[PDB]
Design an enzyme around this catalytic site. Sequence first.
Site, PDB file in Angstrom:
ATOM      1  N   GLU A 185      38.534  47.935  44.601  1.00 48.13           N
ATOM      2  CA  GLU A 185      37.213  47.391  44.857  1.00 48.13           C
ATOM      3  C   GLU A 185      37.315  46.217  45.820  1.00 48.13           C
ATOM      4  O   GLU A 185      38.078  45.276  45.560  1.00 48.13           O
ATOM      5  CB  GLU A 185      36.534  46.941  43.558  1.00 48.13           C
ATOM      6  CG  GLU A 185      36.197  48.082  42.623  1.00 48.13           C
ATOM      7  CD  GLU A 185      34.945  47.823  41.819  1.00 48.13           C
ATOM      8  OE1 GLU A 185      34.047  47.125  42.328  1.00 48.13           O
ATOM      9  OE2 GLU A 185      34.861  48.319  40.677  1.00 48.13           O
ATOM     10  N   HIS A 218      29.028  48.922  41.689  1.00 56.18           N
ATOM     11  CA  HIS A 218      29.438  48.026  40.605  1.00 56.18           C
ATOM     12  C   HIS A 218      28.312  47.056  40.246  1.00 56.18           C
ATOM     13  O   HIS A 218      28.431  45.836  40.379  1.00 56.18           O
ATOM     14  CB  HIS A 218      30.726  47.280  40.964  1.00 56.18           C
ATOM     15  CG  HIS A 218      31.439  46.695  39.781  1.00 56.18           C
ATOM     16  ND1 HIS A 218      32.809  46.752  39.637  1.00 56.18           N
ATOM     17  CD2 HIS A 218      30.976  46.041  38.690  1.00 56.18           C
ATOM     18  CE1 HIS A 218      33.159  46.161  38.509  1.00 56.18           C
ATOM     19  NE2 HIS A 218      32.065  45.721  37.915  1.00 56.18           N
TER      20      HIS A 218
HETATM   21  N1  LIG Z   1      30.312  48.049  35.538  1.00 61.90           N
HETATM   22  C1  LIG Z   1      30.167  46.651  35.150  1.00 61.90           C
HETATM   23  O1  LIG Z   1      29.574  45.874  35.875  1.00 61.90           O
HETATM   24  C2  LIG Z   1      30.763  46.165  33.815  1.00 61.90           C
HETATM   25  C3  LIG Z   1      30.253  45.069  33.178  1.00 61.90           C
HETATM   26  C4  LIG Z   1      30.799  44.662  31.993  1.00 61.90           C
HETATM   27  C5  LIG Z   1      31.867  45.363  31.440  1.00 61.90           C
HETATM   28  N2  LIG Z   1      32.367  46.455  32.083  1.00 61.90           N
HETATM   29  C6  LIG Z   1      33.401  47.151  31.571  1.00 61.90           C
HETATM   30  O2  LIG Z   1      32.934  48.078  30.499  1.00 61.90           O
HETATM   31  C7  LIG Z   1      33.936  48.340  29.684  1.00 61.90           C
HETATM   32  C8  LIG Z   1      33.464  48.256  28.279  1.00 61.90           C
HETATM   33  O3  LIG Z   1      32.838  47.025  28.082  1.00 61.90           O
HETATM   34  P1  LIG Z   1      32.949  46.291  26.597  1.00 61.90           P
HETATM   35  O4  LIG Z   1      32.361  44.917  26.671  1.00 61.90           O
HETATM   36  O5  LIG Z   1      32.207  47.109  25.563  1.00 61.90           O
HETATM   37  O6  LIG Z   1      34.567  46.178  26.145  1.00 61.90           O
HETATM   38  P2  LIG Z   1      35.013  45.798  24.590  1.00 61.90           P
HETATM   39  O7  LIG Z   1      36.024  44.668  24.631  1.00 61.90           O
HETATM   40  O8  LIG Z   1      33.783  45.369  23.814  1.00 61.90           O
HETATM   41  O9  LIG Z   1      35.689  47.116  23.866  1.00 61.90           O
HETATM   42  C9  LIG Z   1      36.342  48.028  24.649  1.00 61.90           C
HETATM   43  C10 LIG Z   1      36.982  49.055  23.721  1.00 61.90           C
HETATM   44  O10 LIG Z   1      38.011  49.649  24.300  1.00 61.90           O
HETATM   45  C11 LIG Z   1      38.786  50.124  23.219  1.00 61.90           C
HETATM   46  N3  LIG Z   1      40.036  50.690  23.603  1.00 61.90           N
HETATM   47  C12 LIG Z   1      41.099  49.946  23.888  1.00 61.90           C
HETATM   48  N4  LIG Z   1      42.097  50.779  24.197  1.00 61.90           N
HETATM   49  C13 LIG Z   1      41.642  52.029  24.099  1.00 61.90           C
HETATM   50  C14 LIG Z   1      42.238  53.252  24.299  1.00 61.90           C
HETATM   51  N5  LIG Z   1      43.607  53.528  24.699  1.00 61.90           N
HETATM   52  N6  LIG Z   1      41.536  54.360  24.123  1.00 61.90           N
HETATM   53  C15 LIG Z   1      40.241  54.294  23.751  1.00 61.90           C
HETATM   54  N7  LIG Z   1      39.659  53.095  23.552  1.00 61.90           N
HETATM   55  C16 LIG Z   1      40.369  51.971  23.728  1.00 61.90           C
HETATM   56  C17 LIG Z   1      38.966  48.879  22.364  1.00 61.90           C
HETATM   57  O11 LIG Z   1      39.286  49.224  20.954  1.00 61.90           O
HETATM   58  C18 LIG Z   1      37.531  48.326  22.473  1.00 61.90           C
HETATM   59  O12 LIG Z   1      36.828  48.676  21.388  1.00 61.90           O
HETATM   60  C19 LIG Z   1      35.126  47.227  29.944  1.00 61.90           C
HETATM   61  O13 LIG Z   1      36.253  47.881  30.680  1.00 61.90           O
HETATM   62  C20 LIG Z   1      34.445  46.198  30.832  1.00 61.90           C
HETATM   63  O14 LIG Z   1      35.413  45.596  31.825  1.00 61.90           O
HETATM   64  C21 LIG Z   1      31.825  46.859  33.261  1.00 61.90           C
END
Ligand SMILES: NC(=O)c1ccc[n+]([C@@H]2O[C@H](COP(=O)([O-])OP(=O)(O)OC[C@H]3O[C@@H](n4cnc5c(N)ncnc54)[C@H](O)[C@@H]3O)[C@@H](O)[C@H]2O)c1
Lengths: 318, 318
Positions: free
Chosen positions: B262, B281
Amino acid sequence: HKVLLIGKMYDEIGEKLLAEYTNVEIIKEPKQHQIHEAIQDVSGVFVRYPTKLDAQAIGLAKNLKVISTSGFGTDAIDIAAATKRGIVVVNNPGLSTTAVTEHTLSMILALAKKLTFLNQCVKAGNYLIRNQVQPIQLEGKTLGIVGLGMIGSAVAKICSTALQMRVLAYDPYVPSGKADTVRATLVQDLDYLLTESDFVSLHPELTDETCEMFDLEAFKKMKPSAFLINTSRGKVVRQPDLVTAIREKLIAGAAIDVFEPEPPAINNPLYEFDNVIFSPHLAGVTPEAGMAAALSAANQILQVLQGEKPPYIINPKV
Amino acid sequence: HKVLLIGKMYDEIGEKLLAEYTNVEIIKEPKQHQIHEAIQDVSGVFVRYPTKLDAQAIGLAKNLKVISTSGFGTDAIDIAAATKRGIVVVNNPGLSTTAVTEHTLSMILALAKKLTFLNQCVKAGNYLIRNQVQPIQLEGKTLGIVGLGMIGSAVAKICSTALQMRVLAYDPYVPSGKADTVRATLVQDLDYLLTESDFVSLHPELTDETCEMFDLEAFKKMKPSAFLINTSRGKVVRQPDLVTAIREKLIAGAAIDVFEPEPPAINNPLYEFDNVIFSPHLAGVTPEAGMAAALSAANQILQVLQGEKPPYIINPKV
Ligand SMILES: NC(=O)c1ccc[n+]([C@@H]2O[C@H](COP(=O)([O-])OP(=O)(O)OC[C@H]3O[C@@H](n4cnc5c(N)ncnc54)[C@H](O)[C@@H]3O)[C@@H](O)[C@H]2O)c1
Ligand SMILES: NC(=O)c1ccc[n+]([C@@H]2O[C@H](COP(=O)([O-])OP(=O)(O)OC[C@H]3O[C@@H](n4cnc5c(N)ncnc54)[C@H](O)[C@@H]3O)[C@@H](O)[C@H]2O)c1
């Protein structure tokens, strides 16, 4: 007993249900001469929206006793010519409530998240557009619903509870408790709904009252940042007034699935605007909904061929 | 005390909150020379994703004591060079849960209702496309969710209850009761989720375990009619394997909001396919979410400038 299928049904199960009891021919996108030849001895006719059954074709059908549309719309059937000959014209409404609800949600979210616009920017290498525009969070925003019927209630229920939106509803023939049931507020002054809403979705029955009820005056009352969603009927919106409203930025954009007339011309003036997204009258044509209307169309044809009154007769005077 | 804003914040409220306490300069899409000159005496730095803070710029900043990203991603900051000088690097995660939930729903519905495809057909006068394709009714279909975190749970809750979908979830570090809470079923075998799902949405944390965990083998296990939704991180999908999967019709299409790297190049091979829709994004960049991260970024800068430990330190060893 023979039956003619002017256009395929939305699912082939209704065609097999007719093939088990009658001799069936199917013609896809026919010329007028194909209709004239294949309808002479035919006893039942199915018409796929929005192709037209005219007075000539009805006049040539000597054994014809029942006509079935594919869905709710009968504006393409010459019902008058069919009543003169005492032919039963049958409908198929209310089998696609869930399909249109999902489709309205898709288009509401598409307008709010600027789906089509942001898609072309990335494909055209303009990832930096994320510095000029931003998507809309639906939470807390006001959804205005015209017509708290089956589909309007379902859309209202989801946007209020799952999307945390403020839902206003305009419907003169509905008790306020119906709005309270789906966590919406019934509003009598349509000006209030127009001036309050960030998203306006149309789900009313097409009547003389709702015919062209969304005209330039209504668009002027709407927020310039509001969006219009139309999955009801094309005649609810006065099309040229929607063009002016979009061109002069009286509203932020629209998403329409129904047209006037149908089918639309290839040079429709609305196609030019990017903040206006279209689908070719498919909000109610999912496989599950298409399977229901196809079965319903097959039953009502067979019931008339066996002297049983079908549930959705358009012209009960025969 | 002076603060440099490399890129605007997602909302101007965080910039006024900093202007009340420090001298602020803002530079939009700068060249490297603009960064070098404006960072010498500056005491705090804000970086707008995904622009890069390199070791040279950090080296030239003599009074710099705190660095704040715009959101969760720190892959564009040279954290190593900043730790060597003892500079606090701060994050801003978890302020956009509702924004990404709505965005995932928009893209799930967009793929199911064939939004972008049907839009071009009508604009190109091909209204008759409603005889070849049909939208998908979500009711009864299986949604597979990887990562039952904050966002994955919220998406699961809406699709199960409001959309009447069957939700499966894969997450090794979550009790099955968490899936039961949002009316989903936790599934250990990722093959089961892949083979069962009509829609696969990615919401896991980016770790060594999830890095490139969606590769060609995973796409092969998926239904050819299934869709991929990616709003998590670009590194979760091995990009070339997604190209092969789409090209060879191993999956019906995809909708991705995050990229690797990105920003993406202007000639990304995925841009060619029509069944793949993009957003730059922005799933977490709504005004309400942008206002939270901007305030959070402003506080943590001021807290370090006043010797208070901010909540989201990336390098606590300083
Ligand atoms: N597109 C965007 O602008 C944006 C904004 C915010 C967050 N995100 C991304 O969205 C995603 C999810 O957000 P979130 O706040 O709910 O994260 P979170 O911390 O609340 O939870 C993420 C989950 O991933 C699970 N996980 C970890 N390893 C795993 C594996 N091998 N297999 C399956 N699950 C697994 C963890 O148990 C956790 O429950 C993150 O990667 C975050 O960076 C993107
Ligand atoms: N796009 C498609 O494929 C598709 C499929 C099915 C139905 N539809 C259309 O969707 C629309 C809604 O569907 P439905 O089944 O819920 O209809 P419905 O019969 O269940 O109710 C429609 C509502 O319109 C209300 N209404 C009537 N006059 C009104 C007025 N002047 N102002 C405000 N409200 C008024 C009625 O009180 C009724 O509650 C209909 O026009 C139907 O033809 C479209």
